[PDB]
Amino acid sequence: QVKEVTQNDGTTTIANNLTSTVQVFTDSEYQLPYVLGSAHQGCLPPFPADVFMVPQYGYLTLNNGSQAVGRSSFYCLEYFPSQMLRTGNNFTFSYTFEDVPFHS
Amino acid sequence: PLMGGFGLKHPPPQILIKNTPVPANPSTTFSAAKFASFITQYSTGQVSVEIE
Amino acid sequence: GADGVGNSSGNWHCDSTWMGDRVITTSTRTWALPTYNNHLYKQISSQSGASNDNHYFGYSTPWGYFDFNRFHCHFSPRDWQRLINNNWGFRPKRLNFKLFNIQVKEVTQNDGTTTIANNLTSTVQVFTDSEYQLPYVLGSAHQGCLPPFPADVFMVPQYGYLTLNNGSQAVGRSSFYCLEYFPSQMLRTGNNFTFSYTFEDVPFHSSYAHSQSLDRLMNPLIDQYLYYLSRTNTPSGTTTQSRLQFSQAGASDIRDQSRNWLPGPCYRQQRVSKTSADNNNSEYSWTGATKYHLNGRDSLVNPGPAMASHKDDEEKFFPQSGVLIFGKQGSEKTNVDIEKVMITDEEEIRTTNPVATEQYGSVSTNLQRGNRQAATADVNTQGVLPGMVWQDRDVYLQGPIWAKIPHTDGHFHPSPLMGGFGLKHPPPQILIKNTPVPANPSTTFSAAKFASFITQYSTGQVSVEIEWELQKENSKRWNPEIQYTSNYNKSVNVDFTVDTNGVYSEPRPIGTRYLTRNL
């Protein structure tokens, strides 16, 4: 569900925006810088009653000092196919782990 | 991996999510510039993960 | 397809796929449409004492329209590089157009506060003409095309056209088109719009440059069997008597060899230099420009016929109007300095086409005789002759894709001047309008037309998918080609990338001619 907020004076009213959409995609071809596994915050909370904020996505590339190098890549996330979800739509996918040794 | 856990050559893919921009009250005359004005909004819902 | 209020009418598709015969480019953008002219047609005309050349008469309409006609809409700078480096030619085949996730917003301005609320029952009405019954605006290189960078939201441009005029006054033949008069699909929130289109068969664009020139198409090792006049007079040693002699042309004199073809046609240009010191100090922007003349009004020929911009090592100079000039990101409309514009350069055409700033050649003026010396004249403008060959202007990255050949008794070599594909039946225009919603009519009846409407605008997504056909490069050249390469050196910002403020920019024009074919 998508909520529009209107801040006027000190009062802020939060109202349903029914026609707005949210767009979601999973890359699954591994075409983006893979952030996960760097032990960043923003994971689902330990305790199920918690509500959590979704973290922002950003990545790093080649650099010399703070200056970029010609090989540094720029990825536009708007450039991938993504499902657009309005209120009353859902998103799913399933995944199968490749064969991996047991943890001891 | 060094931090511990399972090295995966093809790990679980990333799921990226965005609020689609909604412009706010464009001018009546045409302007080729990009919009600096949007409706302020956020979204919420539930997420469910099942691992075997 | 008709969904509810809460269902999404279509998914975001922005993609590029390469099947190696074909590439299919898809792009999706977000648009915002206001209400133009307060829901009413108007006539517009040249203002007051405007010069004879500037008079116009036409109409502005409430309708907006969509134009994807620029290449960079469809191609990313990297997608453009696979095509430009690896291919001799490309043309479009069929395209598809889809509108979805429409939503209409009413805005209420009271005091300083303005609240924007969903209007669920309002509609948007859209039609594509497809019979070409309207003035065709596209292909005039107007702004308002889909943005280059997919994260941008763009305003939909207003639709207007021009007709016959005398001064600013209309002529009896001038036509008035009411866009309300065509069948149009009306879209409420939860409806979508689609159509598909198939390009008529068109010649490939040539993305290749020649490795030979017309002047030098022959074996240097072997002499011709055809004589020319090597000399016209022989000395007696007191004086030179007139005796005419002949020679077979060979490696020694190449310029005299009999040649079987001619360069393309020229319409001459004035030459200006990028270094501010070399240019003359006078106002010749107009009085010195090259022009054509219709119905008593001159018009600058900005694009011109396709010509090389400069000869060897002239890179400083460029034709006055003869090139396409793009502005850098954040450039003002008027009187902007040379550093802001990006000037394209056609020099890859030197082989088959004349330099735009110099004459086609020289021509004998008079008949010589013993008592009078022969004389010649310069030909500054040359129409087509039998046995002439030429190359068309290059399309670049941000140039237009196509244009509509006017419907006329005859036309020669329909390829457009700005570059791109001449299409007799181009992609139709898609026009879009916010349906008027009256506001609180009076309780008593009045036959007058409503001056009061709810103020509202609409927004949604638009998706364009074009299928392109590729012509692969098969060549026996031993040594490496020239490729388009992003420079390896370090920089503050990356080319074709957002800056620290989020402003996307294109550093240079990218034209499509790199790979080399022999002539």
Chains in contact with A, counting 3 or more C-beta pairs less than 8 Å apart as contact: B, C
Q: Where are the alpha helices (DSSP H) in C157-260?
A: none
Whether the CB of A31 is below 8 Å from some CB of chain C: the reply is no
Residue carrying the six token digits 């943005």: C147
Query: How far is residue A80 CA from its own chain's centroid?
Result: 13
Whether the CB of B19 is below 8 Å from some CB of chain C: the reply is no
Whether the CB of A35 is below 8 Å from some CB of chain B: the reply is yes
Residues in chain A closer than 8 A to B41 (CB atoms): 2-5, 17, 20
Closest CA to C147 of C209, C76, C80: C76
Query: Rounded to an integer, what distance in angstroms lies between the CA atom of residue A9 and that of residue A104?
Result: 59
Query: How far is residue C294 CA from its own chain's centroid?
Result: 22
Q: How many CB atoms lie within 10 A of CB C363?
A: 11
Q: Do A84 and C14 touch (CB under 8 A)?
A: no
Whether the CB of C154 is below 8 Å from some CB of chain B: the reply is yes
Closest CA to C243 of C251, C252, C255, C235: C235
Q: Do C14 and A78 touch (CB under 8 A)?
A: yes
Query: Rounded to an integer, what distance in angstroms lies between the CA atom of residue C321 and that of residue C201?
Result: 32
Nearest-by-Cβ selection for C147 from B20, B24, B34: B34
Contact A18, C120 (CB under 8 A): yes
The amino acid at residue C21 is D
Provide the token pair at C378: 């310069």
Query: How far is residue B5 CA from its own chain's centroid?
Result: 28
> What would the 3-class secondary structure string for C414-434 be?
CCCCCCCEEECCCCCCEEEEE
Q: In a 10 Å sphere around its CB, with 0-12 CB exposed, 13-18 middle and 19+ buried, how is residue C25 labelled?
A: buried
**C377-381: long-range pairs with CB below 8 Å, 24+:** C380/C266, C380/C268, C381/C266, C381/C267, C381/C268
Query: Rounded to an integer, what distance in angstroms lies between the CA atom of residue C435 and that of residue C126?
Result: 10
Which site among A21, A59, A80 would you substitute to test the C interface, given the most C Cβ atoms closer than 10 Å to its Cβ?
A21
Q: What is the resolution of this structure in A?
A: 3.0
What DSSP state is assigned to residue C278? T
Q: Do C32 and B20 touch (CB under 8 A)?
A: no
The amino acid at residue C301 is V
User: C385-421: buried (b, 16+ CB within 10 Å) or exposed (e) per residue?
Assistant: eeebebbbbbbbbbbbbbbbbeeeeeeeeebbebbbb
Kindly list the distances between the CA atom of residue C472 and the CA atoms of C21, C79, C207, in Å, as whole numbers in the listed order: 8, 16, 11
For chain A, what percentages of helix, strand and coil (3-state, to nearest 5) are there?
Answer: 5, 25, 70
User: At CA B45, angle to CA A20 and CA C31, rounded to 5?
Assistant: 20
Q: Do C144 and B39 touch (CB under 8 A)?
A: no
Contact C313, C274 (CB under 8 A): no
Q: How many CB atoms lie within 10 A of CB C240?
A: 11
